[PDB]
Nucleic acid binder design. Structure first.
Lengths: 360, 362
DNA sequence: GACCTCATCATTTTCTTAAAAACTGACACTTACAATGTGGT
DNA sequence: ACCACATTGTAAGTGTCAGTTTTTAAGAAAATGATGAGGTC
């Protein structure tokens, strides 16, 4: 309550309401009644022929609107994939990451194998010397430190899968065009030519979290397996919330929302680092100056379960780094702050009362 | 596909939803005072969209429950796959025949095993189930595809003690269709007749309201709501915080029950028009289950096979749906065909039925 | 022989403000399909 | 006791007046790129 530094939220008071309302009135009007009965089972092609036009001009992704699949959430976007694969597979999760591929697979007979990371990337040699079949990396930005995979590891990891023809690799975006200097690199979907990596996108940190649209992109000989095996399903996103975001990205008002949103977070990043570079005796920063959240490491010798529970007395919650890693971390207790939803004209009191609560 | 004169048993009429009363509540919720409602709140739905269903269904269909036991979802299949893993992999699942073509095909991705039954004019073959080894069976109390055979009251009190015999058995009910029967409105729900918690409730706002709002509630009993919140505490919802907080104010301040009664009378006015027109022939076309809801089944005693009859209606660009799909086995030497009217408008019914009849050789 | 702090320059897509324009809020009217009490033999 | 006929009681039919609402376009305007000025080490 009252101060919630969530690690991946968004700011509340800045999305355009009165611009969002106008594109509804071409969608649900008195001629429009064939937008009521249920259409195609994976979103209307006016929503996918624009996604294939957008990700070829902003992230270097190469895809066609008969292969991209829409869905809702990620947990419903992933559960149809585990049954599509089979049940003779052994998964790959990086050691601190998003707590998602693990927490699903507590229901299925499969097994997940961790793999170590560093400030250059994740390990690739242990990917070689085991028998893993599906691995899950975020090549644009590594949660939650902020590491970026180089080109030196990408050729090795993509060439690991080409020699034996039954392994896969899942890219999770989580954030792009929020870098403040430009688009990072062309993503790992761009460098594939043998159709071995699947995408997994999002529409929920960029624009609005609670509209529950998302998307993956399938490769060539798996798209006509998913369409063959699940041709008796239904779509999951409400079709009046899809032709909103067809004209929204045919007539160009998303490509002026994210560019507008960039500076509203950069102006928070500079005013949060100009408050933390005074107390540089202990509160070190690990990870780059990008994204929506910082990772302060506290060398002041208090314990983590006291450090989080100390902030709750003055109606403020932070998010620790015990639940994000399987093993137990170093003696300096890392703590993840965020700056998405805290507004600008209360940052210099928010961080002040947090660091006043901990130690002056 | 896109076609003219589509006759589907779920395609509701499109030209009678109060667009203005859809938009007066939609414009009310996106205000500057009404942020805190664009990020993610609760996961089983908004905490008032669940409070309101427990005073909609309680006095419109009879179900006694609490808003701590409700589960919202999306579709109904995403509401079923978050049940198929709450029970185990030691169960066997009982479907009807004929029925909806869902829970046969959904159970082909799993190691669970299903066994069919038969359906008579009193309901389902309840006498077969007591001497068979099934563990969860899925039935439709208040109606039945594709006939209309309401469950007779003796078999309901039999199938109560069926699932109240042991400890590991459950039953599902599927009352997709209610408040759309002409008089004696609907027999009250199988959830109401149970007082020992072995039946789960399952129904949806996508036949009444709009085909693509994609909301389906669910009710849970006490020893599965607790077991769902525990082993599913890390999901989110699958419907928005605007598609729910429209229908909270859409139902709090009146304009749902007026739509209910208006759509209740419109479809009776549609049905009697069909019963007037098709009665002029009873030579080869007997009609079964003439009374209820949104679809009739229309037999045919043509001197040729049933396969030619569905594809002959494509010759004049019309769509009809046979009954060799809703059943496992195929021995229908009387050719059965189900039809619908719920999408066709009144002004072209006269040409419409004459298209398919004289397309069949009249 | 290296790293990295301020300008101030021309092209440009965001930002409050302003004066003509489709519209819905709260009356009253104001008919139409049809619910329920008082009579036909 | 067996077989109807008509009142008040409202869901509807366009319009009233006004009001809190939507749509087009032009200067300043905050602020991004090729060029030109120092510092530290």
């Amino acid at each position: 309550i009252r101060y919630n530094f969530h690690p991946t939220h968004i700011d509340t008071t800045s999305f355009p309401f009165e611009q969002w309302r106008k594109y509804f009135k071409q969608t649900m009007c008195k001629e429009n009644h064939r937008l009521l009965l249920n259409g195609d089972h994976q979103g209307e092609a006016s929503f996918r022929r624009e996604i294939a036009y957008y990700l070829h001009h902003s992230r270097g992704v190469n895809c066609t609107p008969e292969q991209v699949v829409v869905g809702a959430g990620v947990e419903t976007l992933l559960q149809q994939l585990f049954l599509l694969l089979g049940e003779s597979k052994v998964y790959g999760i990086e050691d601190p990451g998003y707590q998602l591929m693990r927490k699903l697979l507590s229901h299925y007979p499969n097994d997940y194998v961790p793999f170590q990371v560093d400030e250059e990337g994740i390990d690739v040699d242990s990917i070689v010397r085991t028998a893993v079949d599906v691995v899950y990396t975020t090549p644009s930005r590594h949660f939650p430190y902020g590491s970026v995979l180089s080109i030196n590891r990408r050729k090795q990891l993509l060439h690991w899968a080409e020699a034996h023809e039954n392994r896969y690799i899942i890219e999770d975006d989580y954030d792009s065009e929020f870098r403040y200097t430009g688009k990072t690199i062309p993503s790992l979907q761009s460098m594939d030519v043998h159709n071995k990596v699947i995408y997994l996108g999002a529409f929920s940190k960029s624009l609005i979290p609670s509209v529950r649209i998302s998307y993956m992109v399938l490769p060539a000989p798996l798209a006509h397996l998913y369409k063959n095996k699940f041709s008796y399903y239904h779509s999951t996103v409400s079709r009046i919330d899809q032709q909103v975001l067809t004209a929204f990205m045919k007539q160009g008002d998303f490509e002026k929302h994210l560019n507008r949103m960039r500076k509203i977070y950069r102006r928070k990043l500079e005013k949060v680092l100009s408050l933390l570079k005074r107390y540089e005796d202990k509160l070190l920063i690990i990870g780059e100056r990008s994204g929506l959240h910082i990772v302060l490491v506290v060398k002041n010798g208090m314990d983590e379960q006291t450090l989080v529970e100390k902030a709750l007395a003055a109606k403020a919650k932070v998010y620790p780094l015990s639940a994000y890693s399987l093993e137990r971390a170093i003696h300096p207790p890392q703590i993840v702050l965020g700056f998405g939803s805290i507004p600008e004209d209360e940052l210099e009191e928010a961080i002040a009362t947090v660091l006043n609560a901990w130690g002056f």
